[PDB]
Amino acid sequence: HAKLKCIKSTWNCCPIDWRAFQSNCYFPLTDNKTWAESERNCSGMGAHLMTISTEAEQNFIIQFLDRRLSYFLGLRDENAKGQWRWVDQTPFNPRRVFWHKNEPDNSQGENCVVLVYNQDKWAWNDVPCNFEASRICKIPGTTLN
Ligand SMILES: [Ca+2]
């Protein structure tokens, strides 16, 4: 037994309780974890920390986020070289970033990114990967029929 929510021909499906947008399924989670613990939790559901490729994708997810919290995305720079990599292995596209003003601003250590609300706006902030925050898991949708 499994249970899907399918929307359109072809039908795009997600697990019943996940949020659906353009062939992908998302779930924001609010219990605090480090970046690596967060990714561990996502992968346990077949998922990964969310990759954000378009503004449309970000605009979709932010409507389900608590403005008091930071949410880990999948983007990580392990040695502070500016070698940002998506943990889901989507190739990093530096012409499609969404930093807050004056970010990224950590010049040392292992840095990760959170979606955070600041200055009346959702955008990216770089944060030490050992910081504890919420997260957004993302899993590719399935297709029928
Ligand atoms: Ca920062």
Is 78 annotated in a binding site? The answer is no
Please report, for the chain, the start and end positions of each structural domain, with discontinuous segments joined by +. 1-145
Question: Is 130 marked as binding a ligand?
Answer: no
Structural tokens at position 43: 């992968």
**Which method, experimentally, gave rise to this model?**
X-ray
Cα(23) to ligand 1 centroid in Å equals 31
Fold of 1-145: Mannose-Binding Protein A; Chain A (3.10.100)
Output the CA angle 130-135-141, nearest 5 degrees.
135
* d(CA 113, ligand 1 centre) in Å: 8
Cα–Cα distance for residue pair 28/38, rounded to 1 Å: 11
145 is in an annotated binding site: no
Contact 5, 18 (CB under 8 A): yes
Q: How many angstroms separate the Cα of 3 from the Cα of each of 17, 18, 49, 124?
A: 9, 11, 22, 34
User: In sequence order, which residues have a C-beta less than 8 Å from that of residue 100 and are 6 or more positions away?
Assistant: 116, 118, 119, 121, 123, 124, 125
Backbone angles phi, psi at 144, to 5 degrees: -145, 160
Q: How far apart are CA 79 and CA 99, in angstroms?
A: 19
CA of 126 to the centre of ligand 1 (A): 4
Tokens in use for 55?
Answer: 């503004």
Are 115 and 131 within 8 A, CB to CB? Answer: no
